[PDB]
Amino acid sequence: VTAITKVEREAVLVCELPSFDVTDVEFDLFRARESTDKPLDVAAAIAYRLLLGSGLPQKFGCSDEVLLNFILQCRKKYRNVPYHNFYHVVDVCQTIHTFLYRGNVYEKLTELECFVLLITALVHDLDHMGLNNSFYLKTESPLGILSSASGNTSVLEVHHCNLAVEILSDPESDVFDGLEGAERTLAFRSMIDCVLATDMAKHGSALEAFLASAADQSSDEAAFHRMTMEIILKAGDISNVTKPFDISRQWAMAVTEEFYRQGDMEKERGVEVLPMFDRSKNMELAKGQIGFIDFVAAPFFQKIVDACLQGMQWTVDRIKSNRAQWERVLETR
Ligand SMILES: [Mg+2]
Ligand SMILES: [Zn+2]
Going by C-beta distance under 8 Å and a sequence separation of 6 or more, which residues neighbour residue 131? 262, 265
The reported resolution of this PDB entry, expressed in Å, is 2.0
Return the sign of the alpha-carbon dihedral for residues 128, 134, 135, 137: positive
b/e for 178-189, b at 16 or more Cβ within 10 A?
bbeeeebebbbe
**136 CA to centre of own chain:** 21
d(CA 56, CA 48): 12
Method: X-ray
Q: What share of the chain is helix, strand, coil (3-state, %, to 5)?
A: 70, 0, 30
Q: 41 C-alpha vs ligand 1 centroid, how far in Å?
A: 22
d(CA 118, CA 220): 24
Reported residue count of the chain is 333
Torsions phi, psi for 19 (to 5 deg):
85, 5
Closest CA to 81 of 241, 258, 237, 199: 258
Binding-site members for Zn(2+) are 88, 124-125, 237
- Is residue 203 helix, strand or coil? helix
d(CA 114, CA 110): 6
| Residue 289, number of CB atoms within 10 A of its CB | 24
Ligand showing the shortest atom-to-Cα distance for residue 88? 2
Q: Where are the chain's structural domains?
A: 1-333
Q: 218 C-alpha vs ligand 1 centroid, how far in Å?
A: 32
- DSSP track, 30-86: HHHHHTSS-HHHHHHHHHHHHHHHHTHHHHTT--HHHHHHHHHHHHHTS-S-SSSSH
- DSSP track, 276-325: GG-TTT---HHHHHHHHIIIIIHHHHHHHHHHT--TTHHHHHHHHHHHHH
b/e for 297-317, b at 16 or more Cβ within 10 A?
bbebbebbbebbbebbeebbe
Binding-site members for Mg(2+) are 125, 157
Named by the residue before each, gaps in the chain exceeding 2.5 A from C to N are: none
Closest CA to 75 of 39, 103, 100, 111: 39
| 84 noted as active-site residue | yes
